[PDB]
Amino acid sequence: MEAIVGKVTEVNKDTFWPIVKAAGDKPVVLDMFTQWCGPCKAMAPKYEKLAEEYLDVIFLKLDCNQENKTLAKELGIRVVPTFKILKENSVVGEVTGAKYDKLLEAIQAARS
Numbered sequence: 001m002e003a004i005v006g007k008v009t010e011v012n013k014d015t016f017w018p019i020v021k022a023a024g025d026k027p028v029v030l031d032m033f034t035q036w037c038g039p040c041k042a043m044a045p046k047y048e049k050l051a052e053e054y055l056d057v058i059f060l061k062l063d064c065n066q067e068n069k070t071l072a073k074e075l076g077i078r079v080v081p082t083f084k085i086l087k088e089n090s091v092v093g094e095v096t097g098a099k100y101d102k103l104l105e106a107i108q109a110a111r112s
Contacts, residue, residue, distance in 0.1 A: 004019070004058055005026075005051075005055050005056070005057070005058060005059075006051060006052060006055055007048070007051055007052075007059070008031070008047060008048050008051045008059045008060070008061055009058075009059070009060050009061075010060070010061050010062070010063070011030075011060045011061070011062055012062070012063075012067065012068055012071075013067065013068045013070060013071040016030070016060070016062060016071060019058070019060065020086055020089055021089060023058050023086075025087070025088070026056055026057060026058050027056075027057050027058070027085060027086065027087050027107065027110035027111060028057075028058045028060065028085070028086040028087070029050075029057055029058065029059050029060065029083060029084070029085055029086075029107060029110075030060045030061070030062055030075070030083065030084040030085075030086065031043070031047055031059070031060070031061040031062070031081055031083055032061075032062050032064050032072060032075065032077055032080060032081060032082045032083070032084065033061060033062070033063060033064065033080050033081045034063065034064050034065065034080050035063065035065070037080050037081065039080075039081060039097065039098035040080055040081045040098075042098060043081055043098045043100070046100060047059065047061070050103075050104075050107070054107065054111075056111065057107060057110070057111065064077055064080060075091070076091075076094075078096070079096060079097065081097070081098060082094065082095070082096050082097075083095040083096075083103055083106070085106050085107065085109075085110050087110055092110060093106045093109065093110065094106075
């Protein structure tokens with residue numbers, strides 16, 4: 001089997017929950033974005049570096065397009081990018097917009 005940490009894995013309506021359920025007590029971070037999104041593209045490089053530094057956190061991204069509509073709504077989206085933080089199969093935090101600092105704090109909190 002292969003390890004999912006150390007990188008950013010893209011998910012979709014069918015593969016997001018199964019991954020969350022197998023996370024264990026590792027916090028899961030989800031970057032909800034769309035194509036052609038300015039603030040999303042700016043955050044992208046930084047998000048990948050976060051995945052490289054925090055090996056005890058699973059980093060995912062979801063393209064909030066037509067196909068994934070049902071899941072984006074279920075998770076609650078208003079504007080992109082939005083970051084959801086999950087633990088034990090539950091959303092325990094959220095950061096709306098490209099707020100890097102607030103994102104870091106949300107992650108530290110989920111860990112300890």
